[PDB]
């Protein structure tokens, strides 16, 4: 429950379907009227290049924005996630 | 002018003194009472590994939080910045 949790879960689930995303580390989303502005950090393979992380972020942004129309702006950026890492996304 | 712009500029200037930071791509900062909560994306060498980007983010977080005491929480994450890129940081 919480419609905002459901929206945040949609964002996370869309992002986690994009190849190269190991998980979503952090998501902050807020309304400006009907539109959402959001900042998301995705976890990526540590051995990737930063150029590769960059292309994954761009793919995440395209996929999320294409699926969640009320999102007017989404910044996607990257950090290392090791593969033994089950840390659930942090929100708020 | 704008005391919030000055705080944001302090954050950017502290971060840009950390080795490996090519620039600050994006900064979002808000007050909860007297404390600041902030999300920052730093630009990093594209040929770096994501593990290296990660260690730069961690160094940025330590340096910024150590210099700006009112910051209670700072998420630092990374993206590619090419070196011909003079793009000024985006705020708000
Ligand atoms: Mn690019
Ligand atoms: Mn680490």
UniProtKB/Swiss-Prot annotation, chains A, B:
Disruption phenotype: Single gene disruption has no growth defects, no accumulation of magnetite, forms empty intracellular magnetosome vesicles, decreased levels of MamB, mislocation of MamC in 1-3 foci or rarely in a shortened chain. Magnetosome vesicles are fewer and smaller, aligned in a chain with the filament, only a few have very small crystals. Other, possibly precursor magnetosome vesicles are visible. MamI mislocalized to cell inner membrane or in 1 to a few patches. It comes from the Bacteria. Changing residue 50 to G: Nearly wild-type magnetic response. Fe cation 2 binds at residue 54. Changing residue 50 to R: Loss of magnetic response, still stabilizes MamB, CTD dimerizes, binds cations, dimer interface is tighter and twisted. Changing residue 39 to A: Slightly decreased wild-type magnetic response, fewer, slightly smaller magnetite crystals. Significantly decreased magnetic response, many fewer, smaller crystals in vivo, isolated CTD does not bind cations. It is found in: Magnetosome membrane; Cell inner membrane. Changing residue 54 to A: Wild-type magnetic response, no change in magnetite crystal size, number or shape. Significantly decreased magnetic response, many fewer, smaller crystals in vivo, isolated CTD does not bind cations. Induction: Part of the probable 17 gene mamAB operon. Residues 5-92 are annotated as: C-terminal domain (CTD). Fe cation 1 binds at residues 39, 75. Fe cation 3 binds at residue 79. Changing residue 50 to P: CTD dimerizes, binds fewer cations. Loss of magnetic response, still stabilizes MamB. This bacteria makes up to 60 cubo-octahedral magnetosomes of about 45 nm in diameter which contain membrane-bound crystals of magnetite (Fe(3)O(4)). Belongs to the cation diffusion facilitator (CDF) transporter (TC 2.A.4) family. The C-terminal domain (CTD) is probably responsible for hetero- and homodimerization; it assumes a V-shaped, dimeric metallo-chaperone-like fold that can open and close. Val-50 forms the hinge between the dimers. Binds up to 3 divalent metal cations (probably iron in vivo); upon binding there is a conformational shift to a tighter dimer. If the CTD cannot fold correctly the function of the whole protein is decreased, suggesting the CTD confers functionality on the transmembrane domain (TMD), perhaps activated by ligand binding to the CTD. Forms homodimers via its C-terminal domain (CTD) in the presence of metal cations. Interacts with MamB via their CTD. Isolated CTD forms homodimers. Essential for magnetosome formation; required for stable accumulation of MamB. May nucleate iron crystal formation. Probably binds and transports iron. Binds divalent cations, possibly up to 3 Zn(2+) per dimer in vitro, probably iron in vivo. One of 7 genes (mamLQBIEMO) able to induce magnetosome membrane biogenesis; coexpression of mamLQRBIEMO in a deletion of the 17 gene mamAB operon restores magnetosome vesicle formation but not magnetite biosynthesis. This is Magnetosome protein MamM. The gene is mamM.
């Amino acid at each position: 429950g919480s419609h905002m949790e459901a929206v945040q879960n949609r964002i996370v689930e869309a992002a986690e379907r994009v190849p190269g995303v190991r998980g979503v580390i952090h998501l902050r989303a807020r309304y400006v009227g009907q539109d959402i502005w959001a900042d998301m950090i995705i976890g990526v393979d540590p051995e990737n290049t930063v150029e590769q992380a960059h292309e994954i972020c761009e793919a995440v942004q395209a996929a999320v924005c294409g699926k969640i129309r009320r999102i007017e702006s989404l910044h996607v950026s990257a950090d290392a996630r090791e593969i033994g890492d089950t840390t659930k996304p942090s929100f708020s």
